[PDB]
Amino acid sequence: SGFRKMAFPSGKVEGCMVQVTCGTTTLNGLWLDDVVYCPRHVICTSEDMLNPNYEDLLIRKSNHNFLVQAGNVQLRVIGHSMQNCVLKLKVDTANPKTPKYKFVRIQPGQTFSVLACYNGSPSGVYQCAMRPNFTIKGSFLNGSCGSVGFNIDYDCVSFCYMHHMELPTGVHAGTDLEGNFYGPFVDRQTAQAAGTDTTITVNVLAWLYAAVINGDRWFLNRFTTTLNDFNLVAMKYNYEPLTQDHVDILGPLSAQTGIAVLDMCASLKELLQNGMNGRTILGSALLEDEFTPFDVVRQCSGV
Amino acid sequence: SGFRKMAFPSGKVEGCMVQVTCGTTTLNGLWLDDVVYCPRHVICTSEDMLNPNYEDLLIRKSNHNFLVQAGNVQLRVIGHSMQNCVLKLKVDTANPKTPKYKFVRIQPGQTFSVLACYNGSPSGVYQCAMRPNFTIKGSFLNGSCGSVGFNIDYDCVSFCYMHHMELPTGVHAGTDLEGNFYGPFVDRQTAQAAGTDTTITVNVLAWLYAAVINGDRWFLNRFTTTLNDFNLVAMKYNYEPLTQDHVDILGPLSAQTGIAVLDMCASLKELLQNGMNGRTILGSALLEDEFTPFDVVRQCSGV
Ligand SMILES: C[C@H](NC(=O)[C@@H](c1cccnc1)N(C(=O)c1ccco1)c1ccc(-c2ccccc2)cc1)c1ccccc1
Ligand SMILES: C[C@H](NC(=O)[C@@H](c1cccnc1)N(C(=O)c1ccco1)c1ccc(-c2ccccc2)cc1)c1ccccc1
């Protein structure tokens, strides 16, 4: 029993974190095979922040201008390219700690483990969700950039995120490892406001299912609801519209807890309409939406 | 900016997690040098749970009865011993991924990263605190036992916890790597009730200091208090008595935020007396006490 904000083991990803220096600017790179992926804003200077032209900013840079350091060891950059908002620095040496890996682009509401890094050094690990506004409520300081979000499918590290920037609102924006920012964010120092941060309803339901599985069942009522009636109250509370997919995705937890998904929607409604009445669920005084149905299954089947 | 429940990178500890089978029973072992540490209740059977005699239960067991598996590779157990509530299984092979390491016994209120394991396989990572009742509110399933809590001092993994058992209350009890349970817990299936789970006041203050550093400063009042007056209200709310050490330990955060520690105690008092009024601090609707002053410094200086 028990339920915590759990990350994947970062070991496989630690062995991939290198330091990437471009002049004054230093941040993290991901070293897989003979390629080091980092935010392309490594190349940007003290005044390039506002409107940097990267193609233009790349011409000025060469292989020897990218100082790729793997712990204490400098790597030979034997070729570089820009893919969207990432640099792919070709190095002469394949990373011998390269795990089996994929670059997935993760849907909003999906979760991943962040290995926060400074100077290619793993600092800490924490679970994150892709917010429906395609921000992530991370912990990143200066130099945290090029830190990756990831998911482990047994042996296979599925890199879903590379951290780029903090928004004016303490919130984080970054890209997949193909360099495509999640959301409308751009690697420039301009007015970039977050959209509405909606609650990942299916995740809250999964969290409630985790709560019930861990004996926190108080918020259960004798009520049911309809998807449509629940979704009316969901929208009022800035909750993601719930779909049959969400219900299907919660089927495992339903089947596990013998609680129809719509009876849990009924409990969620009462929690949303009435608040939590000073009570806690899974040591939280609000409804956690940064655990997927898969995350709950994982943390309650011990994958 | 941003503030999350961050763990240390588990990589150094992953390379130390082995599987430990004794007959039907399987759990995790920690492989450092030529020694594999696991909960001694690995040796206990289907009826030994109630009152097991371990010395007696060890006689029946030999080196070849301890199946130490490192991934797909069995290790030769060339000697075994019991140290308090841990077995130290001597193996012929030093763990080549042995990090620089110490066994620290951590004070209650101190935090550590848990690498949750099943069959010597890292499942997930999360930050934990030693509760003042010497329980830990973990996420551990069946077979999670022999999972270690730890702290990383740059290169040096300070193993503080080995997970043993879940209490009747969904809460977790275990030992240091010298095998000494934190708290009054014993590796037996008997009435083991948690004491009062008091709030780690110094940690809540650190969390508030992290909140203020991350722009969440609303709970700041124009009030101050005295240690004694604050401690009167602390005790009412089952908060750890605050000491000059706690104030000293918060000195860094005080100095960083230019907020006297006692003005923050004043804010904590108003939060405790008045609750949070539906408001959140650092995405929490209650006062987080599972972040140390050191943890906040670390996550807000990027160590
Ligand atoms: C306010 C925000 N502040 C930041 O983003 C902070 C940073 C703070 C904490 C966590 N995450 C990143 N930041 C870093 O820590 C960093 C810089 C280099 C390596 O790391 C950074 C600074 C600059 C850039 C950048 C520069 C040129 C062109 C385009 C972008 C990118 C990141 C920001 C600054 C500038 C632009 C957008 C957002
Ligand atoms: C209720 C509790 N249930 C548990 O503790 C669960 C377990 C569940 C989730 C997380 N953490 C551990 N548990 C395991 O997952 C496990 C067993 C072996 C390897 O792993 C376990 C079962 C048994 C023992 C044990 C056996 C003989 C003598 C003394 C102790 C120890 C652990 C418990 C059972 C028995 C005794 C105390 C507490």
The residue type of B218 is W
DSSP tally for chain A: helices H, then strands E:
8, 13
Residues with CB under 6 A from ligand 1: A 25, 27, 41, 44, 48-49, 52, 140-145, 165-166, 187-189
Count Cβ atoms within 10 A of the Cβ of residue A76 and give its class: 0-12 exposed, 13-18 middle, 19 or more buried: exposed
Give the residue from B104, B138, B116, B102 showing the smallest Cα distance to B290.
B138
Inter-chain residue contact A7 with B115, CB threshold 8 Å: no
The residue type of B253 is L
Q: A227-236 and A261-274 helices cross at what angle (nearest 10)?
A: 30
The dihedral formed by the CA atoms of A184, A188, A190 and A196, expressed in degrees to the nearest 10: 30
What are the residue ranges of helices labelled H in chain A? 11-14, 54-59, 201-213, 227-236, 244-249, 251-257, 261-274, 293-299
Task: Please say if A145 is a catalytic residue.
Answer: yes
Task: CATH number of the domain at A231, please.
Answer: 1.10.1840.10
CA-based angle A224:A226:A227, to the nearest 5? 125
β-bridge partners, B163? B174
Residue B25 near ligand 2, beta carbon < 6 Å: yes
The DSSP letter of residue B199 is: B
Inter-chain residue contact B170 with A126, CB threshold 8 Å: no
Query: Residue B245 belongs to what domain range?
Result: 201-299
Residue A74 CB neighbours (<10 A): 13
Output the six-digit token pair for B132.
């003042």
CA B116, CA B13: separation in Å to the nearest integer?
11
Q: Please, are residues A203 and A292 in contact by the beta-carbon 8 Å criterion?
A: yes
Q: What are the chain B neighbours of A256 within 8 Å (beta carbons)?
A: none
User: Catalytic pick from A85, A145, A160, A265?
Assistant: A145
CA B11, CA B252: separation in Å to the nearest integer?
30
Q: Please, are residues B113 and B10 in contact by the beta-carbon 8 Å criterion?
A: yes
Give the residue from A119, A126, A127, A103 showing the smallest Cα distance to A175.
A103
Give CA B63 to chain center in angstroms. 30
The strand pair at A101-103 and A121-129 is best described as: unpaired
Output the six-digit token pair for A51.
């409107």
Rg (CA), chain B: 21
Edge-first strand order for the sheet with A17-22 is: A73-75, A67-70, A17-22, A25-32, A35-39, A86-91, A77-83
Residue B98 CB neighbours (<10 A): 16
Give the residue from B96, B100, B282, B119 showing the smallest Cα distance to B207.
B282
Ligand 2 centroid vs B26 CA: distance in angstroms?
Answer: 11
The residue type of A290 is E
CA-based angle A107:A111:A114, to the nearest 5? 120
CA B292, CA B9: separation in Å to the nearest integer?
18
Distance from CA of A60 to the nearest CA of B (A): 31
Max Cα distance, chain A (Å): 68
The beta strand positions in B35-138, using DSSP E, are 35-39, 67-70, 73-75, 77-83, 86-91, 101-103, 111-118, 121-129
CA-based angle A160:B7:A179, to the nearest 5? 20
Inter-chain residue contact A5 with B172, CB threshold 8 Å: no
User: Catalytic pick from B16, B22, B38, B41?
Assistant: B41
Place of tokens 């609680």: A259
Over the range B176-197, which residues count as b (16 or more CB within 10 Å of their CB) and which as e?
bbbbebbbebebbbeebebeee
Inter-chain residue contact A10 with B280, CB threshold 8 Å: no
Ligand 2 centroid vs B145 CA: distance in angstroms?
Answer: 7
CA B209, CA B296: separation in Å to the nearest integer?
8
In this complex, which of A116, A172, A275 lies closest to B278 when CB atoms are compared? A275
Distance from CA of A33 to the nearest CA of B (A): 19
Give the residue from B185, B172, B75 showing the smallest Cα distance to B120.
B75
Give the residue from B76, B63, B79, B64 showing the smallest Cα distance to B18.
B76
Task: Please say if A156 is a catalytic residue.
Answer: no
Count Cβ atoms within 10 A of the Cβ of residue B70 and give its class: 0-12 exposed, 13-18 middle, 19 or more buried: buried
CA B189, CA A73: separation in Å to the nearest integer?
52
Give the residue from B127, B60, B147, B75 showing the smallest Cα distance to B294.
B127
In this complex, which of B3, B11, B166 lies closest to A10 when CB atoms are compared? B11
The number of C-beta contacts closer than 8 angstroms across A and B is 149
User: Catalytic pick from B22, B44, B145, B300?
Assistant: B145
Output the six-digit token pair for A214.
């861990």
Output the six-digit token pair for A118.
């400074």
The residue type of B120 is G
Residue A25 CB neighbours (<10 A): 17
In this complex, which of B3, B118, B126 lies closest to A5 when CB atoms are compared? B126
CA B22, CA B39: separation in Å to the nearest integer?
11
Task: CATH number of the domain at B58, please.
Answer: 2.40.10.10
Rg (CA), chain A: 21
β-bridge partners, A284? A281
Query: Side-chain half-sphere of B75: how many Cα atoms within 13 Å?
Result: 33
DSSP tally for chain B: helices H, then strands E:
8, 13
Q: Please, are residues A199 and A59 in contact by the beta-carbon 8 Å criterion?
A: no
CA A149, CA A127: separation in Å to the nearest integer?
9
CA A1, CA B140: separation in Å to the nearest integer?
6
| Resolution of the experimental model, in Å, one decimal | 2.6
Q: Please, are residues A198 and A245 in contact by the beta-carbon 8 Å criterion?
A: no
Place of tokens 């730890």: B150
User: Catalytic pick from A22, A41, A117, A172?
Assistant: A41
In this complex, which of B4, B8, B172 lies closest to A2 when CB atoms are compared? B172
CA A106, CA A291: separation in Å to the nearest integer?
14
Per the entry, the structure determination technique was: X-ray
Output the six-digit token pair for A140.
């990143």
Q: What are the chain B neighbours of A300 within 8 Å (beta carbons)?
A: 141
Inter-chain residue contact B7 with A122, CB threshold 8 Å: no
Inter-chain residue contact A285 with B276, CB threshold 8 Å: yes
Output the six-digit token pair for B81.
């011993």
